[PDB]
Amino acid sequence: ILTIKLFLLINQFEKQQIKKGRDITSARIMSRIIKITIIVVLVLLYGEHFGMSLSGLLTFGGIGGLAVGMAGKDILSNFFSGIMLYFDRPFSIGDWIRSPDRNIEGTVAEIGWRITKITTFDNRPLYVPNSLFSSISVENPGRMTNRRITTTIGLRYEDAAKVGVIVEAVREMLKNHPAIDQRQTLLVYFNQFADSSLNIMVYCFTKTTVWAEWLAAQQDVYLKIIDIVQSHGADFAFPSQTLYMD
Amino acid sequence: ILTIKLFLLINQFEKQQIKKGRDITSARIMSRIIKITIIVVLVLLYGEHFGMSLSGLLTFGGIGGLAVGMAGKDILSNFFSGIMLYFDRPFSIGDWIRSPDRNIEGTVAEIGWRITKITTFDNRPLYVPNSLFSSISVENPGRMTNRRITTTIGLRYEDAAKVGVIVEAVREMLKNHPAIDQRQTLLVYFNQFADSSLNIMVYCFTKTTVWAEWLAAQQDVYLKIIDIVQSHGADFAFPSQTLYMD
C-alpha cells in the first residue's frame, strides 16, 4: 500500500509536469528516476522483515551514501550559501558590487536560493553561484562615500628648476577648487624619476559620488592642471631617446 | 535461480547490444564486467546463510564502496547537475551564453543529462560537462537589452585649446543621433593623459540589439566623429617620440 500511494503521488506529479508544458520523454525519465530512488530507499529502510543479512545492507548503503555525498557537494553548498545570504547579506538589491578575485562586477538584480542574478554594465544578465560569496572578498562601490582623482604629471628633465613652483600652484588650485573635499587626503608631490620625465603625483577626492559629476570635475581639474603647467614655462614630456650615429 | 535469471537477463542485454551494431569483443567485456559486479553484489548481500564472518564482509565492502565512491564522483556530479539544470535552468535553447571563467561561448543547441551541446561561432559543436554550470558564472548576451558603443579619441598634445569645443560637439552629435538610446548612459569627457595624446572617452548605447544594425550605427558614429574632429582644426595623434642626436 505504501508503494501504491507513492507511485500514485509521483504519477500525479508527472502529469502536473506535463501539463506545465515540457518534453514528454524528459518527464518519463524523471518519473523513472524517482521510482528507482524511492524503491531503493524503501528497500534499505524496510529490509529486515522480509530482508537480508544485516551486514550486506550496511556496506551497500554506506557505499551508496558515500558516493552520493561526495557527488552532490556543490549543489548543496550553493543552497547553504543561499540560506547564509538570506540571514547575513553584505549587499542589497540595486547595489553595485565587485570582487578582486572573480569577475562578478555589476548591480545586484535578484538574490535566490541557488544563484544570484546581476546586471552587468553592458546590460547583460550574469548568474553567480551562491557558494562564491563564501570564499571571495566582495567590494561594494555602491556604498562609497567619495570618488577619487589620481593622476601623474610628467615634466621634462630640463624643467627641474620649476618643479617646486608648479607643485605649489597645483596644490593651491586643488585647495581652492569648490568640487574637492577638503577633509580627505590631498597630496601633490614630486616622487619619481621616470625614464623620460620627472613625475608628480596628484591624489584627491571629490564631494560627489555621481558618475557624470565626478567625470566633469576631473575634466575641469585636468584642464586647469594643463594651464598651470604651461603658464610656468614647462611642458609635458614625450618618450625620449638619445641616438648615436655611425 | 536468482543467478540464472540475472545471467539470462544480461545475456539478452548483450545480444541486444550486438544487434544494435557494435564490436563483439567490447560487448563480451561489458557482459563480463556486469557478471562480476552482480556476483560481488549478491555475495555481499547473501553472505550469511552460507556466508562468512560478519566482520570480514563489513571491512571488505567498506573498502570497496569507499574506493568506488571516490572513483565515481565526477560522473555522478555531472548527472546531478543535469537534474538541477532540468529543474532550474538559467538559459534556454537558442540562447547565446558566455562565461568569464571558462571558454563555453556559443549558442545552446541541446541540454542533456550529462553534457550540454553548444554551437560555437565558427559552426562547430562543443560539449560542456554539466557540473561546470554549478561552479562558474554564466552570462547571457542573448537576453541583452542594448548594445554598447565605447571608444577613445586621442588628440595631439598641441590640441589642448580645442578639447572643450570638440567634447561639446561630440556630445551634441550623440544626443541628436536617431540610433542612440537617450534613456541610457551617455558620457563624453576628457579623462586621461596618455603617453602621446589626450584621451576623450565615448560611452553610449544603441536602441537595437541586432548585430548588423549595431555595427552600421557604430560605423556611422565613427565617421561623424572623424568629421567633427577634423572640422575644428585638431587631428588624431600617432605614437610620438623626442630624439636627441649626438
Tab-separated table of C-alpha atoms in Angstrom:
chain	number	residue	atom	x	y	z
A	1	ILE	CA	0.000	0.000	0.000
A	2	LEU	CA	2.907	2.368	0.692
A	3	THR	CA	4.377	1.668	-2.749
A	4	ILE	CA	0.983	2.197	-4.397
A	5	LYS	CA	0.492	5.523	-2.602
A	6	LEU	CA	3.971	6.755	-3.519
A	7	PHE	CA	3.567	5.645	-7.139
A	8	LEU	CA	0.245	7.471	-7.461
A	9	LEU	CA	1.716	10.604	-5.858
A	10	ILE	CA	4.662	10.737	-8.248
A	11	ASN	CA	2.332	9.938	-11.156
A	12	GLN	CA	0.242	12.975	-10.229
A	13	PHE	CA	3.498	14.944	-10.085
A	14	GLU	CA	4.416	13.656	-13.552
A	15	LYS	CA	1.134	14.718	-15.161
A	16	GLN	CA	1.496	18.042	-13.324
A	17	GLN	CA	4.878	18.495	-15.020
A	18	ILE	CA	3.399	17.533	-18.393
A	19	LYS	CA	0.514	19.996	-18.019
A	20	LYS	CA	3.026	22.718	-17.146
A	21	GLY	CA	4.446	22.156	-20.633
A	22	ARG	CA	7.604	20.107	-21.090
A	23	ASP	CA	9.091	17.350	-23.227
A	24	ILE	CA	7.339	14.041	-22.587
A	25	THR	CA	10.486	11.897	-22.690
A	26	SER	CA	12.209	14.005	-20.030
A	27	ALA	CA	9.142	13.713	-17.794
A	28	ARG	CA	9.133	9.924	-18.213
A	29	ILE	CA	12.847	9.745	-17.400
A	30	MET	CA	12.444	11.887	-14.276
A	31	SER	CA	9.490	9.771	-13.146
A	32	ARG	CA	11.573	6.677	-13.550
A	33	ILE	CA	14.454	8.156	-11.628
A	34	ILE	CA	12.092	8.963	-8.758
A	35	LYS	CA	10.630	5.445	-8.972
A	36	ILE	CA	14.025	3.755	-8.634
A	37	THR	CA	15.184	6.145	-5.904
A	38	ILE	CA	12.032	5.562	-3.841
A	39	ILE	CA	12.274	1.792	-4.335
A	40	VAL	CA	15.905	1.751	-3.178
A	41	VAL	CA	15.149	3.946	-0.157
A	42	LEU	CA	12.211	1.745	0.857
A	43	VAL	CA	14.249	-1.444	0.406
A	44	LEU	CA	17.066	-0.103	2.582
A	45	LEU	CA	14.578	1.143	5.198
A	46	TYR	CA	12.313	-1.923	5.086
A	47	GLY	CA	14.922	-4.638	4.656
A	48	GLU	CA	14.590	-6.745	7.804
A	49	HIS	CA	11.048	-8.179	7.962
A	50	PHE	CA	11.490	-9.848	4.571
A	51	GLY	CA	15.056	-8.585	4.349
A	52	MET	CA	18.610	-9.779	4.098
A	53	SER	CA	21.785	-10.139	6.147
A	54	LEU	CA	22.193	-7.124	8.434
A	55	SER	CA	25.801	-6.785	7.205
A	56	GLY	CA	25.215	-6.561	3.454
A	57	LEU	CA	22.791	-3.637	3.634
A	58	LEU	CA	25.145	-1.709	5.905
A	59	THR	CA	28.004	-1.950	3.399
A	60	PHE	CA	25.786	-1.339	0.359
A	61	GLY	CA	24.085	1.705	1.854
A	62	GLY	CA	27.379	3.048	3.155
A	63	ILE	CA	28.972	2.857	-0.288
A	64	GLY	CA	25.932	4.401	-1.963
A	65	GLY	CA	25.581	7.213	0.553
A	66	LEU	CA	29.309	7.946	0.463
A	67	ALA	CA	29.274	8.216	-3.335
A	68	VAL	CA	26.135	10.378	-3.260
A	69	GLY	CA	27.626	12.559	-0.530
A	70	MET	CA	30.735	13.431	-2.476
A	71	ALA	CA	28.820	13.691	-5.764
A	72	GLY	CA	26.326	16.302	-4.518
A	73	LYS	CA	28.610	18.600	-2.511
A	74	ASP	CA	28.458	21.598	-4.865
A	75	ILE	CA	24.674	21.649	-5.300
A	76	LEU	CA	24.097	21.544	-1.541
A	77	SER	CA	26.847	24.102	-0.882
A	78	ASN	CA	25.119	26.584	-3.193
A	79	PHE	CA	21.856	26.264	-1.244
A	80	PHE	CA	23.644	26.517	2.108
A	81	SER	CA	25.298	29.736	0.942
A	82	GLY	CA	21.873	30.913	-0.206
A	83	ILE	CA	20.497	30.403	3.301
A	84	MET	CA	23.513	32.253	4.709
A	85	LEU	CA	22.894	35.132	2.288
A	86	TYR	CA	19.262	35.193	3.399
A	87	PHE	CA	20.306	35.599	7.027
A	88	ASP	CA	23.529	37.648	6.663
A	89	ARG	CA	23.868	39.547	3.384
A	90	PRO	CA	26.666	42.042	2.626
A	91	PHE	CA	24.655	43.751	-0.137
A	92	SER	CA	21.114	44.613	-1.191
A	93	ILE	CA	19.078	44.872	-4.380
A	94	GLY	CA	20.412	47.635	-6.610
A	95	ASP	CA	23.928	47.705	-5.156
A	96	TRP	CA	26.909	47.840	-7.496
A	97	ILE	CA	29.305	45.140	-6.278
A	98	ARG	CA	32.756	43.940	-7.285
A	99	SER	CA	35.450	41.441	-6.370
A	100	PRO	CA	39.250	41.385	-6.829
A	101	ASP	CA	39.208	37.564	-7.107
A	102	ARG	CA	36.485	36.846	-9.695
A	103	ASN	CA	34.593	38.748	-12.387
A	104	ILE	CA	31.174	39.426	-10.842
A	105	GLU	CA	31.036	43.169	-11.469
A	106	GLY	CA	27.587	44.673	-11.873
A	107	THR	CA	24.481	45.725	-9.980
A	108	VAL	CA	22.524	43.166	-7.975
A	109	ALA	CA	19.159	42.335	-9.550
A	110	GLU	CA	17.941	39.209	-7.743
A	111	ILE	CA	19.060	37.084	-4.795
A	112	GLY	CA	17.916	33.471	-4.980
A	113	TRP	CA	18.392	30.232	-3.094
A	114	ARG	CA	20.884	28.822	-5.629
A	115	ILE	CA	22.252	31.686	-7.751
A	116	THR	CA	22.388	35.479	-7.670
A	117	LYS	CA	21.376	37.433	-10.775
A	118	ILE	CA	23.426	40.558	-11.513
A	119	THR	CA	23.040	43.101	-14.317
A	120	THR	CA	26.384	43.855	-15.946
A	121	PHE	CA	27.378	47.280	-17.241
A	122	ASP	CA	26.743	46.272	-20.866
A	123	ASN	CA	23.123	45.366	-19.992
A	124	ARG	CA	23.518	41.591	-19.794
A	125	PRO	CA	22.393	39.164	-17.080
A	126	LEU	CA	25.025	37.225	-15.144
A	127	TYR	CA	24.247	34.282	-12.860
A	128	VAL	CA	26.685	33.740	-9.989
A	129	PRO	CA	26.598	30.581	-7.831
A	130	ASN	CA	25.954	31.471	-4.206
A	131	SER	CA	28.908	29.482	-2.824
A	132	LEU	CA	31.310	32.032	-4.337
A	133	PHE	CA	30.080	34.531	-1.738
A	134	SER	CA	31.532	32.282	0.987
A	135	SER	CA	35.165	32.231	-0.196
A	136	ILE	CA	35.929	35.517	-2.010
A	137	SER	CA	36.178	39.141	-0.939
A	138	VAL	CA	33.284	41.357	-2.023
A	139	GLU	CA	33.686	45.094	-2.583
A	140	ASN	CA	30.662	47.417	-2.583
A	141	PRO	CA	31.338	50.564	-4.640
A	142	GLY	CA	27.613	51.297	-4.363
A	143	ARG	CA	28.223	52.360	-0.746
A	144	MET	CA	31.227	54.603	-1.429
A	145	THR	CA	31.489	57.968	0.313
A	146	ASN	CA	33.747	59.782	-2.177
A	147	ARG	CA	35.201	59.464	-5.666
A	148	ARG	CA	38.984	59.572	-6.001
A	149	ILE	CA	41.027	61.546	-8.534
A	150	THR	CA	44.588	60.312	-9.072
A	151	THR	CA	46.954	61.302	-11.864
A	152	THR	CA	50.618	61.790	-12.758
A	153	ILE	CA	52.198	64.891	-14.301
A	154	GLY	CA	55.327	64.055	-16.274
A	155	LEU	CA	57.638	67.020	-16.821
A	156	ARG	CA	60.766	67.189	-18.950
A	157	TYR	CA	64.129	66.632	-17.281
A	158	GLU	CA	65.069	70.195	-18.283
A	159	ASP	CA	62.176	71.535	-16.161
A	160	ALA	CA	63.838	70.536	-12.883
A	161	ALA	CA	64.159	74.180	-11.785
A	162	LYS	CA	60.373	74.697	-11.879
A	163	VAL	CA	59.137	71.601	-10.017
A	164	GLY	CA	58.562	73.351	-6.692
A	165	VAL	CA	56.556	76.300	-8.001
A	166	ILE	CA	54.417	74.029	-10.190
A	167	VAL	CA	53.741	71.725	-7.232
A	168	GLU	CA	52.745	74.680	-5.049
A	169	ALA	CA	50.473	76.121	-7.746
A	170	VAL	CA	48.725	72.785	-8.314
A	171	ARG	CA	48.284	72.292	-4.562
A	172	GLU	CA	46.765	75.762	-4.165
A	173	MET	CA	44.435	75.187	-7.123
A	174	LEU	CA	43.249	71.891	-5.637
A	175	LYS	CA	42.774	73.515	-2.224
A	176	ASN	CA	40.631	76.315	-3.705
A	177	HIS	CA	38.538	74.126	-6.030
A	178	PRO	CA	34.849	74.084	-4.991
A	179	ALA	CA	34.365	70.452	-6.079
A	180	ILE	CA	37.164	68.949	-3.940
A	181	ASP	CA	36.551	67.537	-0.463
A	182	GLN	CA	38.996	69.288	1.873
A	183	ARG	CA	38.506	66.830	4.758
A	184	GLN	CA	40.078	63.919	2.844
A	185	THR	CA	43.574	63.151	1.573
A	186	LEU	CA	45.132	65.795	-0.687
A	187	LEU	CA	48.698	65.131	-1.860
A	188	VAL	CA	50.742	66.850	-4.584
A	189	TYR	CA	54.420	65.883	-4.557
A	190	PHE	CA	57.323	65.094	-6.874
A	191	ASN	CA	58.104	61.457	-6.151
A	192	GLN	CA	59.555	59.608	-9.151
A	193	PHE	CA	62.463	59.672	-11.588
A	194	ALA	CA	60.881	58.130	-14.674
A	195	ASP	CA	62.712	57.005	-17.807
A	196	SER	CA	61.985	60.210	-19.743
A	197	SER	CA	60.310	62.516	-17.211
A	198	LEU	CA	60.062	63.707	-13.619
A	199	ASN	CA	56.744	62.558	-12.171
A	200	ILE	CA	54.437	64.487	-9.836
A	201	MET	CA	51.585	62.621	-8.153
A	202	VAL	CA	48.116	64.124	-7.700
A	203	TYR	CA	45.775	62.461	-5.201
A	204	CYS	CA	42.464	63.933	-4.024
A	205	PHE	CA	38.751	63.257	-3.514
A	206	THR	CA	35.501	64.831	-4.698
A	207	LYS	CA	32.434	65.563	-2.594
A	208	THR	CA	30.040	63.952	-5.076
A	209	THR	CA	29.653	60.255	-5.853
A	210	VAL	CA	27.719	60.683	-9.120
A	211	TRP	CA	29.417	59.338	-12.242
A	212	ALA	CA	28.840	62.309	-14.554
A	213	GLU	CA	29.569	64.968	-11.926
A	214	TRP	CA	32.803	63.238	-10.919
A	215	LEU	CA	33.874	62.974	-14.561
A	216	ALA	CA	33.113	66.660	-15.165
A	217	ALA	CA	35.086	67.711	-12.086
A	218	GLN	CA	38.002	65.525	-13.190
A	219	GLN	CA	37.986	67.111	-16.655
A	220	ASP	CA	37.948	70.609	-15.154
A	221	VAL	CA	40.863	69.736	-12.860
A	222	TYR	CA	42.845	68.281	-15.771
A	223	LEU	CA	42.347	71.390	-17.910
A	224	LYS	CA	43.376	73.642	-15.019
A	225	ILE	CA	46.483	71.492	-14.490
A	226	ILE	CA	47.402	71.845	-18.170
A	227	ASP	CA	47.025	75.623	-17.955
A	228	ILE	CA	49.097	75.833	-14.758
A	229	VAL	CA	51.895	73.710	-16.224
A	230	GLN	CA	52.033	75.677	-19.471
A	231	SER	CA	51.926	79.093	-17.774
A	232	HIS	CA	55.193	78.434	-15.884
A	233	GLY	CA	57.259	77.688	-18.996
A	234	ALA	CA	57.378	73.909	-18.530
A	235	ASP	CA	55.916	71.251	-20.818
A	236	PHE	CA	54.824	67.628	-20.814
A	237	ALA	CA	57.384	65.024	-21.842
A	238	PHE	CA	57.129	62.547	-24.694
A	239	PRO	CA	59.111	59.299	-24.560
A	240	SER	CA	62.690	60.300	-25.301
A	241	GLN	CA	65.819	58.660	-26.666
A	242	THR	CA	69.453	59.502	-27.375
A	243	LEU	CA	70.722	58.337	-30.766
A	244	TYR	CA	74.381	57.790	-31.657
A	245	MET	CA	75.049	57.690	-35.398
A	246	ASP	CA	77.920	55.947	-37.175
B	1	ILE	CA	17.661	-19.470	-9.621
B	2	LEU	CA	18.391	-15.784	-8.978
B	3	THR	CA	21.818	-16.116	-10.601
B	4	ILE	CA	20.317	-17.943	-13.589
B	5	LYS	CA	17.661	-15.249	-14.058
B	6	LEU	CA	20.204	-12.429	-13.832
B	7	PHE	CA	22.593	-14.199	-16.211
B	8	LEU	CA	19.845	-14.711	-18.793
B	9	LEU	CA	18.737	-11.076	-18.457
B	10	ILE	CA	22.228	-9.705	-19.045
B	11	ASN	CA	22.726	-12.206	-21.877
B	12	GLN	CA	19.614	-10.818	-23.563
B	13	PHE	CA	21.073	-7.349	-22.988
B	14	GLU	CA	24.344	-8.472	-24.588
B	15	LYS	CA	22.705	-9.802	-27.755
B	16	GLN	CA	20.614	-6.611	-27.820
B	17	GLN	CA	23.856	-4.609	-27.847
B	18	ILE	CA	25.294	-6.834	-30.582
B	19	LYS	CA	22.184	-6.461	-32.753
B	20	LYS	CA	22.401	-2.687	-32.317
B	21	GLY	CA	25.774	-2.946	-34.065
B	22	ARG	CA	28.976	-2.846	-32.037
B	23	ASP	CA	32.332	-4.574	-31.668
B	24	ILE	CA	31.900	-8.108	-30.341
B	25	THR	CA	34.907	-8.027	-28.004
B	26	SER	CA	33.677	-4.875	-26.261
B	27	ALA	CA	30.255	-6.470	-25.765
B	28	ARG	CA	31.866	-9.573	-24.246
B	29	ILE	CA	33.989	-7.435	-21.922
B	30	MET	CA	30.983	-5.394	-20.771
B	31	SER	CA	28.988	-8.579	-20.178
B	32	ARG	CA	31.786	-9.922	-18.072
B	33	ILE	CA	32.045	-6.739	-16.077
B	34	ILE	CA	28.320	-6.938	-15.327
B	35	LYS	CA	28.701	-10.624	-14.418
B	36	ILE	CA	31.441	-9.959	-11.860
B	37	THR	CA	29.675	-6.894	-10.446
B	38	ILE	CA	26.407	-8.801	-9.977
B	39	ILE	CA	28.232	-11.758	-8.414
B	40	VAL	CA	30.031	-9.495	-5.933
B	41	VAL	CA	26.829	-7.635	-5.041
B	42	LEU	CA	24.945	-10.898	-4.488
B	43	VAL	CA	27.778	-12.352	-2.390
B	44	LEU	CA	27.881	-9.270	-0.163
B	45	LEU	CA	24.073	-9.237	0.127
B	46	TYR	CA	23.672	-13.005	0.542
B	47	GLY	CA	26.716	-13.749	2.673
B	48	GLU	CA	25.264	-15.055	5.935
B	49	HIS	CA	23.226	-18.209	5.204
B	50	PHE	CA	26.257	-19.897	3.640
B	51	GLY	CA	28.411	-16.877	4.414
B	52	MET	CA	31.453	-15.829	6.357
B	53	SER	CA	32.493	-13.922	9.471
B	54	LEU	CA	30.261	-10.869	9.917
B	55	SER	CA	33.407	-8.744	10.396
B	56	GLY	CA	35.278	-9.578	7.191
B	57	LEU	CA	32.444	-8.608	4.849
B	58	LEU	CA	31.957	-5.305	6.661
B	59	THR	CA	35.594	-4.304	6.128
B	60	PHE	CA	35.750	-5.640	2.560
B	61	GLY	CA	32.547	-3.919	1.472
B	62	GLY	CA	33.530	-0.720	3.245
B	63	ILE	CA	36.861	-0.575	1.424
B	64	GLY	CA	35.257	-1.392	-1.921
B	65	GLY	CA	32.431	1.101	-1.534
B	66	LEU	CA	34.804	3.815	-0.331
B	67	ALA	CA	37.067	3.327	-3.354
B	68	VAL	CA	34.077	3.260	-5.717
B	69	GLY	CA	32.615	6.349	-4.057
B	70	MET	CA	35.677	8.483	-4.597
B	71	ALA	CA	36.322	6.998	-8.050
B	72	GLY	CA	32.883	7.871	-9.463
B	73	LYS	CA	32.383	11.379	-8.061
B	74	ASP	CA	32.683	13.261	-11.367
B	75	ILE	CA	30.320	11.046	-13.372
B	76	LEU	CA	27.600	11.307	-10.726
B	77	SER	CA	28.174	15.048	-10.269
B	78	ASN	CA	27.543	15.619	-13.978
B	79	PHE	CA	24.176	13.837	-13.772
B	80	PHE	CA	23.218	15.671	-10.575
B	81	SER	CA	23.945	18.981	-12.299
B	82	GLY	CA	21.876	17.743	-15.236
B	83	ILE	CA	18.905	17.175	-12.933
B	84	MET	CA	19.446	20.639	-11.448
B	85	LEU	CA	19.509	22.146	-14.949
B	86	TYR	CA	16.278	20.304	-15.724
B	87	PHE	CA	14.578	21.881	-12.717
B	88	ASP	CA	16.304	25.306	-12.579
B	89	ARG	CA	17.918	26.426	-15.837
B	90	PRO	CA	19.437	29.890	-16.402
B	91	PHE	CA	19.171	29.600	-20.201
B	92	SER	CA	17.076	28.061	-22.965
B	93	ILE	CA	17.576	26.522	-26.395
B	94	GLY	CA	18.911	29.093	-28.844
B	95	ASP	CA	20.406	31.433	-26.240
B	96	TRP	CA	23.889	32.835	-26.777
B	97	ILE	CA	25.746	32.279	-23.497
B	98	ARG	CA	29.193	33.126	-22.170
B	99	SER	CA	31.376	32.846	-19.087
B	100	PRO	CA	34.312	34.904	-17.749
B	101	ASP	CA	35.823	31.781	-16.122
B	102	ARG	CA	35.820	29.177	-18.922
B	103	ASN	CA	35.522	29.121	-22.711
B	104	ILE	CA	31.945	27.973	-23.362
B	105	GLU	CA	30.905	30.768	-25.716
B	106	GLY	CA	28.236	29.911	-28.258
B	107	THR	CA	24.524	29.304	-28.692
B	108	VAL	CA	22.826	26.497	-26.784
B	109	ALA	CA	21.784	23.615	-29.044
B	110	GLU	CA	20.925	20.745	-26.689
B	111	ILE	CA	20.607	20.224	-22.936
B	112	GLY	CA	21.223	16.649	-21.821
B	113	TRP	CA	21.524	14.678	-18.612
B	114	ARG	CA	25.342	14.530	-18.760
B	115	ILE	CA	26.598	17.221	-21.160
B	116	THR	CA	25.287	20.339	-22.880
B	117	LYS	CA	25.837	20.759	-26.623
B	118	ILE	CA	26.603	24.298	-27.804
B	119	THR	CA	27.188	25.601	-31.331
B	120	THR	CA	30.254	27.834	-31.471
B	121	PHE	CA	30.531	30.905	-33.681
B	122	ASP	CA	32.726	29.083	-36.214
B	123	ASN	CA	29.997	26.435	-36.693
B	124	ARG	CA	31.496	23.687	-34.537
B	125	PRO	CA	29.880	21.591	-31.795
B	126	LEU	CA	31.179	21.905	-28.238
B	127	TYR	CA	30.258	19.521	-25.419
B	128	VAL	CA	30.335	21.007	-21.916
B	129	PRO	CA	30.049	18.825	-18.786
B	130	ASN	CA	27.011	19.816	-16.754
B	131	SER	CA	28.897	20.177	-13.452
B	132	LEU	CA	30.597	23.322	-14.787
B	133	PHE	CA	27.222	25.076	-14.569
B	134	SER	CA	27.319	24.607	-10.779
B	135	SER	CA	30.594	26.444	-10.063
B	136	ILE	CA	31.086	29.179	-12.699
B	137	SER	CA	29.292	32.406	-13.539
B	138	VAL	CA	27.178	32.315	-16.700
B	139	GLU	CA	26.473	35.427	-18.763
B	140	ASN	CA	23.551	35.541	-21.211
B	141	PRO	CA	24.186	38.071	-24.002
B	142	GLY	CA	21.173	36.563	-25.774
B	143	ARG	CA	18.945	38.414	-23.285
B	144	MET	CA	20.651	41.808	-23.579
B	145	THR	CA	18.536	44.958	-23.780
B	146	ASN	CA	21.014	47.255	-25.560
B	147	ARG	CA	24.322	47.211	-27.413
B	148	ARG	CA	27.110	49.413	-26.068
B	149	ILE	CA	29.409	51.708	-28.053
B	150	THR	CA	32.651	52.675	-26.306
B	151	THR	CA	35.686	54.324	-27.869
B	152	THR	CA	38.608	56.660	-27.182
B	153	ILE	CA	39.561	59.766	-29.166
B	154	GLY	CA	43.262	60.545	-28.889
B	155	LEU	CA	44.145	64.142	-29.734
B	156	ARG	CA	47.585	65.694	-30.063
B	157	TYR	CA	49.062	67.483	-27.059
B	158	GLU	CA	49.068	70.687	-29.138
B	159	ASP	CA	45.257	70.475	-29.444
B	160	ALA	CA	44.706	71.223	-25.750
B	161	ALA	CA	42.937	74.512	-26.548
B	162	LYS	CA	40.192	72.730	-28.524
B	163	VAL	CA	39.274	69.883	-26.150
B	164	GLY	CA	36.164	71.548	-24.732
B	165	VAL	CA	34.545	72.510	-28.032
B	166	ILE	CA	35.250	69.075	-29.521
B	167	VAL	CA	33.750	67.379	-26.457
B	168	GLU	CA	30.635	69.556	-26.674
B	169	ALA	CA	30.241	68.914	-30.409
B	170	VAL	CA	30.580	65.145	-29.981
B	171	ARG	CA	28.096	65.172	-27.093
B	172	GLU	CA	25.557	67.138	-29.140
B	173	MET	CA	26.008	64.807	-32.119
B	174	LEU	CA	25.431	61.762	-29.911
B	175	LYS	CA	22.380	63.399	-28.322
B	176	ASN	CA	20.828	64.134	-31.738
B	177	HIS	CA	21.621	60.765	-33.351
B	178	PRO	CA	18.432	58.796	-34.154
B	179	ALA	CA	20.079	55.423	-33.426
B	180	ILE	CA	21.209	56.218	-29.855
B	181	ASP	CA	19.106	55.366	-26.803
B	182	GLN	CA	18.706	58.589	-24.816
B	183	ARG	CA	17.434	56.865	-21.652
B	184	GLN	CA	20.763	55.102	-21.002
B	185	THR	CA	24.253	56.272	-20.064
B	186	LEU	CA	25.806	58.871	-22.379
B	187	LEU	CA	29.245	60.182	-21.389
B	188	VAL	CA	31.754	62.240	-23.394
B	189	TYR	CA	34.627	63.589	-21.298
B	190	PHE	CA	38.371	64.213	-21.402
B	191	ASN	CA	39.757	61.890	-18.748
B	192	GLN	CA	43.305	60.711	-19.488
B	193	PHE	CA	46.822	61.995	-20.096
B	194	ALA	CA	48.216	59.300	-22.376
B	195	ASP	CA	51.852	58.892	-23.403
B	196	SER	CA	51.419	60.683	-26.742
B	197	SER	CA	47.847	62.015	-26.676
B	198	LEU	CA	44.996	63.469	-24.641
B	199	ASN	CA	42.202	60.904	-24.436
B	200	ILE	CA	38.451	61.535	-24.611
B	201	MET	CA	36.088	58.708	-23.676
B	202	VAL	CA	32.868	57.993	-25.577
B	203	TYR	CA	30.275	55.769	-23.900
B	204	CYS	CA	26.719	55.250	-25.168
B	205	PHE	CA	24.072	52.666	-26.075
B	206	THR	CA	22.006	51.840	-29.156
B	207	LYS	CA	18.301	51.038	-29.256
B	208	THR	CA	18.779	47.929	-31.399
B	209	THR	CA	20.320	44.616	-30.362
B	210	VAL	CA	20.880	43.257	-33.889
B	211	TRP	CA	24.495	42.600	-34.859
B	212	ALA	CA	24.485	44.222	-38.305
B	213	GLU	CA	22.391	47.236	-37.286
B	214	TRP	CA	24.613	47.898	-34.270
B	215	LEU	CA	27.734	47.648	-36.434
B	216	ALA	CA	26.271	50.043	-39.014
B	217	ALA	CA	25.327	52.570	-36.330
B	218	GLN	CA	28.818	52.305	-34.833
B	219	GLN	CA	30.415	52.937	-38.234
B	220	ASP	CA	28.197	55.978	-38.811
B	221	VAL	CA	29.086	57.370	-35.377
B	222	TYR	CA	32.803	56.827	-36.011
B	223	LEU	CA	32.691	58.635	-39.358
B	224	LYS	CA	30.784	61.544	-37.812
B	225	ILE	CA	33.369	61.711	-35.011
B	226	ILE	CA	36.188	61.860	-37.568
B	227	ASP	CA	34.443	64.696	-39.404
B	228	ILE	CA	33.794	66.631	-36.180
B	229	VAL	CA	37.408	66.283	-35.038
B	230	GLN	CA	38.839	67.348	-38.392
B	231	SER	CA	36.481	70.318	-38.812
B	232	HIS	CA	37.787	72.012	-35.634
B	233	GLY	CA	41.438	72.044	-36.726
B	234	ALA	CA	42.577	69.182	-34.487
B	235	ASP	CA	43.952	65.808	-35.567
B	236	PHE	CA	44.489	62.290	-34.282
B	237	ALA	CA	47.834	61.500	-32.679
B	238	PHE	CA	50.334	58.863	-33.747
B	239	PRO	CA	52.781	57.436	-31.203
B	240	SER	CA	55.364	60.161	-30.688
B	241	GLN	CA	58.970	60.407	-29.559
B	242	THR	CA	61.628	63.041	-28.918
B	243	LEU	CA	65.051	62.232	-30.367
B	244	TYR	CA	68.336	63.741	-29.179
B	245	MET	CA	71.183	63.372	-31.671
B	246	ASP	CA	74.907	63.313	-30.918
